[model samples]
Target chain A: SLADSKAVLNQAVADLSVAHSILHQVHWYMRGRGFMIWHPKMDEYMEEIDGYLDEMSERLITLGGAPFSTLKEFSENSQLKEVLGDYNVTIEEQLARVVEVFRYLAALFQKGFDVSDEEGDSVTNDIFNVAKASIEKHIWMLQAELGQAPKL
Target chain B: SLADSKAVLNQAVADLSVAHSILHQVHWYMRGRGFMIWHPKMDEYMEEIDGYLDEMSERLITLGGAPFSTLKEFSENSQLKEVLGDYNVTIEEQLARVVEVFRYLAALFQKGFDVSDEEGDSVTNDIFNVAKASIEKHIWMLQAELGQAPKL
Candidate 1:
């Protein structure tokens, strides 16, 4: 039903917002050689994720549903874990953490697409398409940054 | 003269590329109370700068002038200061450094606009307009983050 689609989109909004904060954490704490090379790239990833969150929020409203309006609400609804405290970690570890979040988002966006398609809501489905594409690109780039070989 | 326009655009391309690297450095090094709040915003700033660099580079090519194509070229041509080493400093200092760079860019873009307009190069002039607008916004946000009043 359209109602279920709305619920999923709302959840995505929450998850993406949480990811936005986590990206910030990584953006600030990542150091060493990668700081010169990979730090700016973090901003690109953060911008893309923030865009997804905004689109998902709008889609929820378009479907006559309310979206989370406060940081507290976003934190409470989000299933993605919040990254806090001093990161004092390796750049590889930070990249891996980003990959973890991207994987979560990829799955979440896929599920949203499936539900939207089943509900005959092409607009919402298209939103998921855009998000999923970007998330896959992020995952691939993060993996490459980690110097991991391509997986089958 | 269009020659001057070309010089200005080429300089802009180099300066923006250098700023792109510096933003990455700041993005990774910024921490403390503002880490979570300001980190993602750095990405927004970096993305805008990267876009500016790409646009200026393309515009230079369009004018039959070659743009900087290598890291060495960018470093040599850029007039803005490069931020290197571990940025183990206060968040205020980090924000101050960003403000310094944004101030440099804002002035540089204004000069480019003036040169382009005098040379009847409206296209390059328009590019300066866009870059200036964004840089001013960045300056304002960074200043706000620093808890400072707006300065003319």
Candidate 2:
């Protein structure tokens, strides 16, 4: 049970770290139109998501599971794809990819739901629930930015 | 020096709280065209800023200074002004006012430079310096959304 819960949370941490890296690429490449507004916010977004990374990793350790601490480990465990930092990436694509990663991260969070529950780790399960809720709202917000509803 | 530093630190908490409330009004009343993008970000902005509030207040308490705990005190000490909720307010004005308060808040943070430094409170001075930098960038960013440079 600890194994399942630990694995789920480790995945959460891994994916979040990967998300942070990809978003940085987005941040570095972002420009044009709303560049100023969007640029500063990319910092906030990175920090906001990483706040969870901090918590999930700590939570993993609390349960006798070690959290991934390196890039390679993050890549092996991450469910989301990665993109190298590229200046040629358009703002639209940058934003869309961020939305894509967030959506996939939400699925990973949700993936932990039953796994943690079945593992009898209520704390991890609770974390999964809250993370899922937060990520879903983030998804909805980004969708609105892209001129669509949440699409749910 | 500690006394001067304390007063300055106290003011930051009061005003940042006031800014939070005003930003919320701006948040709720926002609508139209870019509403989706700008709208969700209001939440991020509020939380991003309040993160500083938590830090400043805790730092104040650490320095044997008390941060304000009431609206009346916040009203009395805050350099930034306030506005009540109004749906009739245009999104243009809403954003502009946020820029207004951010700009004013930046000034207040700068105001602390001398107060803290003269008092030899390097920690508070550093906090002021960093907050000033952060709030000013926030101003430049919102200005970009409004189609202007930082105007510096």
Candidate 3:
């Protein structure tokens, strides 16, 4: 129906779809490292992420929209790429790319907020706000990784 | 009394002095929250940070150097005050600041490495390399939190 509510729903569907793809990427990449580096921490991080994404996706669906899965659907709808290319890079490089992507996604959320607010849709506005705040938290952690600040 | 090894140890002591203060600030701030957000995952993150700080401080002591304390000492030694002022700002602001701090610390490591390598200081170089790698990993996680390419 080209409705603003539908647009928000579509975006949620797209973002969640891309998130799952990245989860699989983590699972794939975590396969090679030994216990010292890869075993418990990576497994725990991925498990937590998967749990969060599952809950988030379910919330979106409960809001009444079909969650899309196909590559075509994701590419068509997603503002994020669910980037699959992490095999050869240093760990720093892999994470740095993620930080950059979040900045991009945050910008998207700002846009979504503006659109949703203009449409007077509380549901969409609430959804965008939560996503925006969550992404903001993630960015802070990435910055810590870069060691952008000196010691205390 | 100050040989190549002594110089490296001194610098590390200085580095830890500054780093520890920032961690202390965060520690105090979190305590103020009474850890309302202290889930198992959050506790794990906090413990990881605390453990690293203690380990580094111990290593510095073992190397016969004193870690710095006092606001005066940090003011003289730390290159990390820029990110401290905007605590009440958005999570994005905090994330950006953290990344800024991470980058600053990495540069210090790079500088130390260059000097240490020139002086045939294998111990110092090894320490810097390992620490830098760990910092890089932290940046990666922070980027993931930010929701970017995993590096953001």
> How many pairs collide in each candidate, listed in order?
1, 0, 46
In Å, residue B11's CA in model 2 sits off its true spot by 0.7
Instruction: State the lDDT of candidate 3 residue by residue for B25-44, as single tens digits.
Output: 44334432323432233344
Identify the candidate with maximal TM-score: 1
lDDT to native, each model: 0.76, 0.73, 0.54
| Deviation from native of the Cα of residue B91 in model 2, angstroms | 2.0
lDDT of 1 by residue, B26-140 (tens): 7655567877877677788877886887678668767877665434455678887653334367788878888888899999999999999999999999999988988888788
Question: Interface RMSD value for candidate 3, one decimal?
Answer: 16.2
TM-score of each: 0.51, 0.50, 0.41
Q: What is the lDDT of residue A46 in candidate 3?
A: 51
Docking class of 3: incorrect
Q: Tens digit of lDDT per residue, candidate 3, span A82-126? A: 555557755565555556555665666666666766777656665
For residues A1-152, could you state the per-residue lDDT of candidate 2 as single tens digits? 22588887888877886786667557655667777877777788887787788678668767876666534455667766654345566777778887888888778877788888887889988888898897788778888888988764
Q: What is the lDDT for B108 in model 3?
A: 69
Q: What is the lDDT of residue B25 in candidate 3?
A: 44
Q: What's the chain B TM-score of candidate 1? A: 0.94
List the candidate numbers ranked by lDDT, top first: 1, 2, 3
TM-score of 1: 0.51
Q: How high is the DockQ of candidate 2?
A: 0.02
Most accurate candidate by lDDT: 1
